[PDB]
Design an enzyme around this catalytic site. Sequence first.
Site, short mmCIF file in Angstrom:
data_model
loop_
_atom_site.label_atom_id
_atom_site.label_comp_id
_atom_site.label_asym_id
_atom_site.label_seq_id
_atom_site.Cartn_x
_atom_site.Cartn_y
_atom_site.Cartn_z
N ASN A 11 0.82 -1.23 0.00
CA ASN A 11 0.00 0.00 0.00
C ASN A 11 0.85 1.29 0.00
OD1 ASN A 11 -2.68 1.13 -0.02
ND2 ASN A 11 -2.40 1.68 2.15
N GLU A 37 1.83 -2.43 -5.32
CA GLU A 37 1.47 -1.06 -4.95
C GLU A 37 2.66 -0.30 -4.37
OE1 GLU A 37 -2.37 1.66 -3.92
OE2 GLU A 37 -2.11 -0.15 -2.69
N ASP A 150 -2.01 -9.64 -5.67
CA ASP A 150 -3.30 -9.17 -5.22
C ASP A 150 -4.29 -9.39 -6.36
OD1 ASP A 150 -5.55 -7.81 -4.25
OD2 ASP A 150 -4.50 -5.92 -3.89
N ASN A 152 -7.51 -9.18 -5.93
CA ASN A 152 -8.64 -8.27 -5.70
C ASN A 152 -10.01 -8.95 -5.76
OD1 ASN A 152 -8.58 -5.42 -4.91
ND2 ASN A 152 -7.09 -5.18 -6.60
N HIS A 247 -2.99 -4.88 3.65
CA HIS A 247 -2.75 -6.30 3.43
C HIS A 247 -1.60 -6.79 4.29
CE1 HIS A 247 -4.71 -6.51 -0.73
NE2 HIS A 247 -4.68 -5.21 -0.46
MG LIG Z 1 -3.71 0.00 -1.29
#
Ligand SMILES: [Mg+2]
Length: 256
Positions: A11, A37, A150, A152, A247
């Site tokens: 993130n 990310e 990820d 999602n 995460h």
């Molecule tokens: Mg994020």
Amino acid sequence: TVLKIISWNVNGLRAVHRKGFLKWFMEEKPDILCLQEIKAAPEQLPRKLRHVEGYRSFFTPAERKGYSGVAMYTKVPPSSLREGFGVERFDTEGRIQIADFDDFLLYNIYFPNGKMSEERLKYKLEFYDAFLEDVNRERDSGRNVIICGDFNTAHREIDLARPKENSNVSGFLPVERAWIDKFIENGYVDTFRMFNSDPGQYTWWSYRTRARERNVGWRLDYFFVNEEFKGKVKRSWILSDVMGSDHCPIGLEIEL
Ligand SMILES: [Mg+2]
């Protein structure tokens, strides 16, 4: 000889650095660390930040400033990396990093979030389509493949705390879940479920509404391998107590 691979949506790399990333990385000692990310221009990253002793690093940023981006740290370098599927609209978002190691290709993927709009949901599902085409092409040619990142999407009702209330929220739409079914049907194995059949096993929690303390989470992060390679998988687990992002990391151990 065990090879340990970790995958983590951090993130934002600068953010996770402020929250114990390097100390964690030094103690965990994976052979390969896949990150999603990044949210930073790699050329603007100071060496004290980017370079980690004992590791090579490779960064794949988005066209868009500060958006998306993936990276890979590895003790042993791949022969090269590929940064796309060959489809312009999917290859420019800093979402795809495919490393060629001897024994496998390692796909480090940040799959798109479809919540924003119907157009982004369409993009997500077509990205899924292009990914499956890509991995099938490689798998068809005799390559063993490890895919992490990820996705999602939570696969089954067990994979999130609130399956019913999210039945029409992107992340748990029948269309998305059906794609994971399809991906699996095509000959790829959700490695976590090889070893752990328990509920309450998640990898993402909203920073809001005390989600992580209430375990109101979703399993959005996976390690998949092709069927032929599954015998080499020895562990697949969630590093649930590692903080610093919305995460947590996930792990794979393989014996080659
Ligand atoms: Mg994020």
